[PDB]
UniProtKB/Swiss-Prot annotation, chain A:
Species annotation: Arabidopsis thaliana (Mouse-ear cress)
Family as reported in the entry's similarity comment: Belongs to the PYR/PYL/RCAR abscisic acid intracellular receptor family.
Subcellular location: Cytoplasm; Cytoplasm, Cytosol; Nucleus; Cell membrane
UniProt motif Gate loop: location: 82-86
Protein name: Abscisic acid receptor PYR1
Annotated gene: PYR1
From Swiss-Prot, chain B:
Main location group: cytoplasm
The protein's name: Abscisic acid receptor PYR1
Record localization: Cytoplasm; Cytoplasm, Cytosol; Nucleus; Cell membrane
Quaternary state and interactors: Homodimer. Binds ABA on one subunit only. Interacts with HAB1, AHG3, ABI1 and ABI2 when complexed to ABA, and possibly with other PP2Cs. Binds to CARs protein in an ABA-independent manner, both at the plasma membrane and in the nucleus. Interacts directly with CAR1 and CAR4. Interacts with CARK1 in the cytosol. Interacts with AIP1 in an abscisic acid-dependent manner. Interacts with FREE1 (via N-terminus). Interacts with the E3 ubiquitin-protein ligase RSL1 at the plasma membrane.
GO BP, one annotated term: positive regulation of response to water deprivation
Organism classification: Eukaryota, Viridiplantae, Streptophyta, Embryophyta, Tracheophyta
A GO MF label: signaling receptor activity
Modification after translation (UniProt): Ubiquitynated and degraded by the proteasome upon binding to the E3 ubiquitin-protein ligase RSL1 at the plasma membrane.
Protein family according to the UniProt entry: Belongs to the PYR/PYL/RCAR abscisic acid intracellular receptor family.
Function: Receptor for abscisic acid (ABA) required for ABA-mediated responses such as stomatal closure and germination inhibition. Inhibits the activity of group-A protein phosphatases type 2C (PP2Cs) when activated by ABA. Can be activated by both (-)-ABA and (+)-ABA. Promotes drought tolerance.
Species name: Arabidopsis thaliana
Positions of short motif Gate loop: 80-84
Gene3D superfamilies in the record: 3.30.530.20
Domain free text: Upon interaction with ABA, the 'latch' and 'gate' loops change in conformation leading to a tight dimerization and the creation a surface that enables the receptor to dock into and inhibit the PP2C active site.
């Protein structure tokens, strides 16, 4: 859990990249992760649009186009493990900024229930005297689905984001170690 | 550590060693937890409340006259987002003296047939400090699914550590 000082530092960034204009029947979350590791090492991992399996769980495969150029606008085709109710996810790059260290994607297809899913990730340096760590921020907006709460999966999406941010931290940290 | 490893060999031999069937596969995992063993043990012994240290648990239902005894079962419904749906699990072993427990799935709406598991809590005192090493093994029939079971076990062990470390502090 971020410290009050950490929180204050990120206020501006949250307003810039992680503030969404919601549609009626949609919602938004925001998570945070502290990583004892250099920021630019963490970005290298995060920016790899063609390789999410590196920091995300449950990914069986991730394929892209052959003459693939990782610019905004390009897509990826994720296949998720069997054991998750989801099958295939077509995901589009929305933002990449090696400068500001911001990235983001939107789901534009695939056999799943969530519609109009869209998330944004940002990386942040924290120099305090002796040392240097990172804080990552991952927000997302997704429609409020129609049907009984039997089947609402917004809680899952949420702990997925959380689980992946833990793996990212683990992965990023064992590279500095 | 190579040293932690040396002390658990025996326990692996007694509790985490399986007689495979043709088509099944076994696996072992370890987790270092900064917290006392009795604290850890006291969480993982709670058969009626696995959600306390596991991910993805919609519900867990036992029974109102539930006494915690080998043979007893529990009904678990998974969060939504996961294919398999509900599962029936029975307590295979409970030993508060050697701190060992285990269960096997005996029903449910899924693919993991003949899934069986064992968990052990181990003590480790070093310079002054006192930590814990947990071991979890499992066996399952194989016909994509071993991958998911393995991922789950690791995650759950990671939640256990989080939860137990949070309780000590
Ligand atoms: O029912 S369980 O409590 N079994 C315990 C357990 C632990 C590890 C792997 C499989 N099983 C359970 C927890 C979490 C998940 Br995901 C499960 C998914 C399918 C079936 C059961 C699941
Ligand atoms: O395909 S994903 O890698 N997309 C990224 C992502 C992450 C969290 C929530 C949704 N989307 C993915 C992984 C795990 C669960 C998912 C369930 C539905 C759709 C995609 C899933
Ligand atoms: Cl994984
Ligand atoms: Na589901």
């Amino acid at each position: 859990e971020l410290t009050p000082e950490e929180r204050s530092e990120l206020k501006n960034s949250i307003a810039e990249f992680h503030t969404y204009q919601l549609d009626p029947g949609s919602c938004s979350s925001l998570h945070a992760q502290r990583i004892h590791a250099p920021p630019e090492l963490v970005w290298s991992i995060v920016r790899r649009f063609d390789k999410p399996q590196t920091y995300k769980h449950f990914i069986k495969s991730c394929s892209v186009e052959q003459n693939f150029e990782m610019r905004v606008g390009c897509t990826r085709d994720v296949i998720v493990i069997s054991g998750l109710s989801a099958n295939t996810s077509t995901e589009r790059l929305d933002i990449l900024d090696d400068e500001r260290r911001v990235t983001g994607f939107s789901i534009i297809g695939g056999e799943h229930r969530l519609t109009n899913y869209k998330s944004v990730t940002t990386v942040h340096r924290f120099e305090k005297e002796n040392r240097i760590w990172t804080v990552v921020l991952e927000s997302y907006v997704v429609d409020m689905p129609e049907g009984n709460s039997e089947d609402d999966t917004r809680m899952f999406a949420d702990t997925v984001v959380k689980l992946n941010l833990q793996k990212l931290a683990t992965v990023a940290e064992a590279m500095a170690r």
